[PDB]
Design a protein around this nucleic acid. Sequence first.
DNA 1: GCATCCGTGAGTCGAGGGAAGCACAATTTAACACTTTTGTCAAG
DNA 2: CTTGACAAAAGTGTTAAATTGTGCTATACTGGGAGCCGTCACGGATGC
Lengths: 222, 105, 83, 94, 1114, 40, 16, 263
Amino acid sequence: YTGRGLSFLDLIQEGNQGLIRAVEKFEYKRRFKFSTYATWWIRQAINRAIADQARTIRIPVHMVETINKLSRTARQLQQELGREPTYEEIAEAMGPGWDAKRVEETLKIAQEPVSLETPIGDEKDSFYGDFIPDEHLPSPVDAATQSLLSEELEKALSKLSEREAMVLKLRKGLIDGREHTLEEVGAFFGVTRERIRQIENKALRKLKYHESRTRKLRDFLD
Amino acid sequence: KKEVRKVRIALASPEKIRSWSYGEVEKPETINYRTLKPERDGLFDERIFGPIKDYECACGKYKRQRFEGKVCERCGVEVTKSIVRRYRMGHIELATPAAHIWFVK
Amino acid sequence: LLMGVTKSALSTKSWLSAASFQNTTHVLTEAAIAGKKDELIGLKENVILGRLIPAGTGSDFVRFTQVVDQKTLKAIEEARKEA
Amino acid sequence: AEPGIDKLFGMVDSKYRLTVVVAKRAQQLLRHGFKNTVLEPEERPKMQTLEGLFDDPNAVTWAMKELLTGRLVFGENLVPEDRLQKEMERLYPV
Amino acid sequence: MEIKRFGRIREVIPLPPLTEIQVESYRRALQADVPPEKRENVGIQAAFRETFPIEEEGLVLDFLEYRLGEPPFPQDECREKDLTYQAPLYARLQLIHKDTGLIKEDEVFLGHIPLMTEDGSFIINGADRVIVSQIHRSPGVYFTPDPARPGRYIASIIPLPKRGPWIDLEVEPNGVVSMKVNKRKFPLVLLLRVLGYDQETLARELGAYGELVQGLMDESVFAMRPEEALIRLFTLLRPGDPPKRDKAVAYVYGLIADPRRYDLGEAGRYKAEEKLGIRLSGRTLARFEDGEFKDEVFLPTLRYLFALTAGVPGHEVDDIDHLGNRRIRTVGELMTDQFRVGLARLARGVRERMLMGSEDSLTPAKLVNSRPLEAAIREFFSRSQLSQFKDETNPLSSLRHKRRISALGPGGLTRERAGFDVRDVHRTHYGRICPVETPEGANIGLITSLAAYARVDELGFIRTPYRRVVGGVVTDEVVYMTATEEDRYTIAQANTPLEGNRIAAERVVARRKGEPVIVSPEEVEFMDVSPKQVFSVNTNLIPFLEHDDANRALMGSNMQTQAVPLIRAQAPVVMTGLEERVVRDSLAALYAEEDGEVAKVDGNRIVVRYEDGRLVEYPLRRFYRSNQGTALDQRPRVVVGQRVRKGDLLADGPASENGFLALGQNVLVAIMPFDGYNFEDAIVISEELLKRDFYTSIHIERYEIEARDTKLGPERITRDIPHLSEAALRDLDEEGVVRIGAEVKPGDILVGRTSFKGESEPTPEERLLRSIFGEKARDVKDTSLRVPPGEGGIVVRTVRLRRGDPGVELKPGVREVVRVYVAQKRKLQVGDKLANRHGNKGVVAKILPVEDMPHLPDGTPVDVILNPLGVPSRMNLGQILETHLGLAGYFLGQRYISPIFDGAKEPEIKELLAQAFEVYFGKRKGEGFGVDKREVEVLRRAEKLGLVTPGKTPEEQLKELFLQGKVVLYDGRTGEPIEGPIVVGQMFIMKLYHMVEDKMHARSTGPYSLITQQPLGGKAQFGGQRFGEMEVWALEAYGAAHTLQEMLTLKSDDIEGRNAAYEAIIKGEDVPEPSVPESFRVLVKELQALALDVQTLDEKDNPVDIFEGLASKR
Amino acid sequence: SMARPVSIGEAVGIVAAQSIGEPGTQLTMRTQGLPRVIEL
Amino acid sequence: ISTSDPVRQYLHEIGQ
Amino acid sequence: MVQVDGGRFATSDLNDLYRRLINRNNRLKKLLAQGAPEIIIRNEKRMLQEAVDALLDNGRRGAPVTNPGSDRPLRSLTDILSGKQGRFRQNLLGKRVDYSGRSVIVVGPQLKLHQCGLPKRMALELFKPFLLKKMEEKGIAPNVKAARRMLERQRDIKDEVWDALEEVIHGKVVLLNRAPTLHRLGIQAFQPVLVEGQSIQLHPLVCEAFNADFDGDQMAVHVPLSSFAQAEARIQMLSAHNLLSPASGEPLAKPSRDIILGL
DNA sequence: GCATCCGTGAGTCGAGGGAAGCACAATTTAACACTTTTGTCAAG
DNA sequence: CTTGACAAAAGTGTTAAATTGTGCTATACTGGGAGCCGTCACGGATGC
Ligand SMILES: [Mg+2]
Ligand SMILES: [Mg+2]
Ligand SMILES: [Zn+2]
C-alpha cells in the first residue's frame, strides 16, 4: 500500500489496529487459519486510513471511493482509446447518473492543495508564497477611502437636524454598528414607527438635496 | 503605553503552552472539502483561533461589532476581529512526552 | 583571549543579533536555557524590532534636542517667572 | 549641496543634532501652517509655478533657512514638551 | 554591393549540420523509421529489451516490437492549444503461461513520446523547449593518485549515472587491498574469493610485481568455501539482515552482476576494454552463470592497479578532466534513461499485478499500466534542469541553445560545489568545446558551447576533424577523432604555409598532447582543418577575433544571442562567412527544395512549381511571437515567375537579409568623446537612425484571462461590466474582448470579465451612501483584464478556447480562456542597450538631432559616437579594425568576408582605404572643391602630433590620415573641426533584448505578502524593491535612523503604520510615528510555536503586550 | 568623510566593516590576498 | 538493528 | 491555506507536519485505549517522537520528511527561522519596501552633483499620494478618489497633473541605490529632476562611488516620507555632502575618465 | 591524534514557474408550509 | 405623531434526501526498498 499518501510505518500501525480488531473478532471454531480472517481486517484498516489521512483537505470515504473508481475508469478508457478520454466518455463508462459535469466537478474536488514552499525557478530560492498577494487585510488605499467617506458623511449629516441625523445614524448602524428597526428606534425615542420612517425619508430627501446642490459625495459611490 | 526596552527568551513550560492556547487541536482536519469552511476542532478551527471575517461567528448569528467580546452559544466562535487569527495559538496534548530536538541534537 | 570575528560575533551578549547571524538553533537554545534578556544595545536588534537605532539621529546624545524660536521662548519665560 | 550647509554643520557639535533640529523645526512649521516662522516676508523661500512665485511647501528648506538666520534656539532641556506645545498653539492658533 | 573575401586557408570540408547533436541523437533514440526487425539495440529499443521479459516465476511478459503513430495534432495546433507535440507509442507484448504453454499477444498503448521538430526542439505544453546536452565523467575504470599518501594509486570503477555504485580499490598501509562500496570499506580479498578465485590463481596472475600480491594472500578466507564467503560479504555490506544464502546471492548479483541494476554503459565498457586491455562480454562487473560468479573487471582492474603502483612503463594515471574521459549525454540518451526508469516502474507494476489476479485469465493489456512511463517522460520533459525554455530571441539564439553543453543537471555537478578544476579550459577542449564562450558569473566553465566542427560520436565523446598529413603533403582525408586518440599524434596548425599540398614552412607550429612545439614537415602527422573548429558558432561570427581579448570576445559572442530582430535588419559589412550557414541551419528562412519556377508570391504563402511539376505551397510564418516576445516573421524574397535553383532562398527568416544573418544595423560610427554623453560605456546616437527606422523592432505580448466556475456562480466574459462608462468599453466588441487593431494604453481593458461578489454585508457608511443615492448594489464586480502599467500597443490577435473544443484540455472548473496578442513597434530610445560583436556594449544615453552630430566634410553626419576610452582597458582591437574596414567599404560600396585568424590584415585594409580615399577625394576634386581651411588647421595639428609627414601637400596628408583610418571630422554645433582627426567608419551594432521599457518599474502601494504582510517582489506582481541587509547597513552607516525605521516599518509591514502614513499623506499631513513590524510579531509567534517563551519587557522588566491584547486569554 | 572630528552617534562599526569589505573583491585570490585577510 | 532507520528497527523488533 | 485566483488551494508544509503529529498522537491514544502490546505502543511512541522532531526541525535527525509525490523536504519551524532564506535574514534584517521603483541608469552630464534625472512616470507612481493631495488642492480633481481614478488610466491624465507633480517634488530628494551596496555611498540622496523617458539619469562624478557604468546597470529609487527622513537624506545622505571616502579620507567624488582626459 | 559531526559559503533583478465495495446508522442540508416582525401606504 | 390594515422578507417547526461515518467481508498468505560519489571543502567543537 506504499506510495498512496501514507508512509510505510503509518500503514503498518493502521494494519496493527486492524489486526487487533481481527483478533477480537476471530473465531477458532470454524477451523480456518488466522491469516485468512486477519488479512481482511488489516487491509480494511489500511485502506480506511489511506482514505482518511492521505489528503491535507480530508475527503469522505465514499467520495474517495468515487474518485478512485473514476481514476480507474479514466485509465481504462485512456489505454483502450490510445488517448486521454474526454469527460463524456468517462461519464458514459462510469454508468447511469454520471454526466460530463459531474465528472468535472469530481475531478475539481480531487485536486490536492499545492505547497506554499514549492520552488519556482532553477535556483530554488523563490517559492509559490512569494507570488500570492494577501487579499484579506484592506490595502492602505481602502482604509484611506473608508476614512474619507466616513469624514464626508459626518460632515454631510451636520446639515441635518439634531434628531433626524441620529435617526439615520441609528437606522443605518452608524453608532452601534448594527442596523436598528423602526420599533427599536421608537423605543429609544418614544415615537411610533410611521413617524420614524417619515422623518427618515424627509432627512434622506434633505441629504439628496444638499448633495445635488454641492456634489461633494458622489465620487465615493464608485 | 510602555515602550519595549528588552526582549527575553526562555523555556516554555507545558502550563505556559496551555495558557497560550485558546483551545486544543484534536483533529487533523483542515477545512471541509465541499463548503471550504474550517472543520471543527481542526487546524483552522474558528472556535480556537478566531473568526475568519471580522465580528462574525461561524453560525452567522452575530455579524456586527455591537456584540463585541462575545462568544456565540450556537457556534462557540468569539465575535472579534479576524486579525486575532494571526496571533491566537493552539496546542496538541501529547499522549506521551516528546523531547524537544533543539535540546537533544 | 583572542577569537575570530565569527566566534566573537556568536558569543555576543545579545541573542537577537547572534541568532540573526549564524547558528540560530544553537544561539536560541543557549539563550532560552539561560533565560537571556536582550537589552537592545546594538543596531541589529533595533532593526529586528523596527525601533530607532541608537546611532545617528537615533542616539541619546542628539535625539532629545529641542528647537524653539525667540518669541515663544520669551513668552514662556515671562509667563512663568512673573510669579 | 544645500545652501549654507557648511555653516549648519559648524553651528552644532554633531551633524545628527543638526538633522534633528532641522526636522523638528520643519514639523513645527508644518503643524502651525508656517505661521510660526521667524523669516521676514522677504526671506520666505519661494518656488516658481506657472501661475507665479508661491511659498515653498518644503518645510525642511524653511527650517534650514531659519537655522541659517540664527533666530532659532536649539538645545536640550530648554522647555517642557507639553508647555512648549501649549504655548506654541496659543501664540500660533491652528 | 559586392563582397570581397579574404583569407588563404582552404577548408576541405564544410561545417557539419549545426543541430545534428540534437536531431541525430533523438533519431537514434526513437528509431521510428527503421523497421522493427532491423532496429539496433539502442535507445528505447534497448530499454524495452532490457526491462523485458517480465517474469514473476509461470507468467512471462515478453516484448516483441514497438511502433510510434502519427501525432494527434500538428505543431501549430499544439502551440495554439497549449498541447505537447507527441506521437502515440504502442508496444506489442505476449503473455506466456509456462504451465499451459499458451501465448496471447496484443498491442498495448504505452503512451505518448514527445517528438522533436525539424529544427531540433520540442513543444511541451505548447512551449518550445530545448534539451541541453550534459557533460559528465565517462564510465569505466580510472586510476588516480592518492593525495594524502604519495606514491599510491586508487582505482575507481564508475558505471552509468544511477546505474550502480562506484567501486573503490585502494592499497591500504597495512598491505590489504580494500574495496569501498556504498560508504562501506571491506577487504577486496573476500569479494575476490566470492568470484571463484584461489591462492594459486592470484599468485600466478598478480604475483609478478612484488609485495603487493603478498598483501593479497590472506589464507584465513581463501580455504573458506565461496558460499560462506558470499554470505560473509553480504553481512559486511548490509549488517543486521538474517544471513541467508538466497538473499545474499541475490544481493551480490544485484550489486555487481545484474545488468538491470548495474550498467557500465557502452562508453564505459569501451573505455574499460581500451584501458585494461581486456574484452568484456557484457556491461557488468561480473557475470552470474551456472550458479556461480565469474569475474569480468575486478582482476584486470587490480592487476592494472598493482602494476601502476609498481611502476611499469605502460601504465599511467587518468586525468578525470581529460575530455577523452568526459562524455556527452545528448537529448537521446537522457530521454532513453528516463524512458528506462519509467519502464522499470511499469515492470514493477506488471509484476505486482500478475502476482494477484487470475493467472489463467490475464491479458498483457490488463497487466501493463502505462501511467508510470508517461509520468516519468512528462517529468523529464517538463521539470528537468536540462529541459530549458527555448531561447529564440533570434535564430542564432536557438542555434546556440541547441548546441549548449551543461555540466549541471540531474547527475552532474552543482553550481556551488564545483571547484576551479571542473571550470578550467582543459587542453583537450581544443577543437571540441569553445574556450571563450561561457556565461560569466556563477556558471562560468559549467556551461559551454560545442565547437563549430565538433561532433559527438556514438559513445558520447566529442570528436574533432583533422587532415591527414603523410610525407609532408597535406591530404584531403579528414579523420574525426577524440582527445585520447588526438594525444598520440603531432598535429600542425591550420595556418601552416603550403605550396599547394606540400608543407612549405621548414618550421611548423604543432601540438603534441596539447603542448605547443616546433617540428619539421616530416614530423607532422595531422593538420587542423581550419581555425574555425576551435571556436563555437557564436564566436566564429566575430570578425578580427585575433585582435580581441578573450574576456571581451566572451561578451560579444554571448550578446550576439540577445540581439532582437529588426524590421530593417542588415548583414554586417565585415563578415566571417558563417552568416549564410547560420541562417540555413537555423531553419528560420525558406529555401527551394529543387530547381523550379515561382508560381505565386504573397505575404502569407509562396507557391512554387518544381521541375517535376508538383505544386508546393509554403505558408509563411508571419508576426509570430517567440518565447521572449519578439516578432518572428518570414518575408518573401522572390517574385512570380522567377526561376529558382535547388537551395535558393525563398523567404528571409527573422534577423536575416538575403540569407545572411542580420542581427543589427551597419551604422556610421565616430570614435570620440562627446560632452560626457559617452561617459562610462554610454552611447550617443543620431535622430536620423530613428527617422529611417533603424533599430526598430516588433514585440508581441500575450495576456491571458480565464472565465471559471465558482461556488457563487460562473465568471462571465461580457461587455456589460458594472459601473463603467462608454469610454472605457469603446474598444471592446460585443463578446467583451478588445477588437483586433485597437490601440491599447496602460489601464485599458483587454477582456471584460465580471465575477460574483462574495456574500458580505456592506459597511454602514456604504449602506448610507447607497440609500442616499438610491442605488441597489449589484451582484457582480469588475474582474476584467487590463493593460499593466508601462505596456500597450496594437491588439493584433485574439484567441478564444472554450471547454469541449477539439484538443483543448482546459483545467477543471474553467469555462473558457481568452488570450490577447498585442504587438508594439519599439524604436531605439534612451536606456536601450546596444552592443557589437567585440564585446563593446552600452545603453543609449543621448539622441541628438542630425544637425548636432559630427559630420564628414561632404556633409554626412555620423550615426553613433563611441567613447575611445572603452578600448584600452578592454583590449578589444577588433572593433577598430572592423571600423576601418567599414569605412573602406562604405566609400567603396562593398562588404567583406574576413574569416577569424585568417582574413583581412592591416596592409589589405590600408590598400582598401587607399581606394576608398581615391574615390572620396576624387569626387570632391571633380566637383571643384579644394582643401578646407579647417581641414588645413586639422592637418597642421596632426603634423604637430606626428600623424602625417611634414612637407607633403594637404591632399597627401589627408590620404595618410585616411590610411590610418582617421578623417577630418566637423562639429555640428560649432561648425569648427575637431582639433584632431577622428576614427570614423562603418560598424555593425546590435540592439539587445534588454530594453528600459521592460525594466522601468515604480510602486507606491500594492500587493502584500500573506504571512509577513511585506510588499511582493517583481515588476509583474507590481512589487516593491528589496531593501536587503547591505542597504540597511548603508543607512546605519549614514546614521539615517528615521529613514531606516520608515523603510523597516512604515513602508514594509507596519499595517497600522502604513495605513496611517498613506492617509496622512493624502490629507496633507506628516506621517505618524511607526509601530512594531508585523514580521517581528510573526517571529515571536514562530518562536512560541517552538515552545520558547519570548517576552518583550519594559524599563521595569514588566511584560509589554505587542499584540494589542488580541492574543491574551481575557 | 568630512575631514573633521567625528560627530557623537556615528555607527563607526558599520562604517569600519563596510570600509574593510568593499575592496575585498579587488584582493587577489589565484596566505596571500583575500584568504590571508580571512585567516587574519 | 539500525538506530537511525525506524523501519529496520521495527522489523528487527517484530522478528524476535 | 489560501485559495488562489484560479480556485486552487495553496498551503504551507507546517500544516502537513501538524497533521502528521496529530494523526500519530490520536492513533497512539487509540492504541493505548485498546491495550495494544508493548511492541506496537513502542513503535507508535517512536513515531510520535520522530513527528515532533520533524515538526520542530525537519532533517536534523534521520531522513527528512517529504510530502508524498515529491522529494522536497517539508519546511519546519527551524528552517523557517534559520538560514539566508529564514525569517531573520529575509524579513527582519531586510524587507521589501513601498514607494520604491527601479530602472536602467544613463549618464546625465548636465546634472548638478546633487541632482538626478527621475522619469516622469516613475515619479508619478512613487509620489502618488502626494500627487493626489496636490491634485485635490488645485482644481484638477474634486477629491482624492477622483484623482486616483484619473491616474488609473494613462489616457485620462491631463497636462496639469505633470505641473502638480513638479510642484510636489520641490525640495524633496530620493535615494538612488545600486546593488551590491558594498559601502555606505552605495545609497545616495539626489534632488530629482523630472525627465522625459524611462531611464534614470546619473551624475558622472558619483559613478565611482556607486561602481556604476552605463552598460546596462539598473538602480532602485526610494522615497523618504516624513520630515525626519527627508532631513536625514538632504543633510547626511546628499551626494554633494559626501565627497570624501569614509574608508581613507581621500576624495571619492572626483574627476573621472573623460574629465581627466580633457583636463 | 584522530575521528566524527556540524554549520557555512555576496547582493539586486527577471522568467517562467502554476483494496474495493456494500450495507446501514447518523448527520447535515434543502425544502416547505406556516407564523411572524418589518417595511410601507392611508388617512386621522 | 397615531392606529389600521397589509405585502413581504425573515424566522420556525418537521421531513425526505443527500451526504457522511462506521462495521465487515472466514482457503491461505507472516522482516522494505531504493539505493547508487566529481561523495564539497573546511574550520570549530566534542570526545574518545
Ligand atoms: Mg550571466
Ligand atoms: Mg555595468
Ligand atoms: Zn455563532
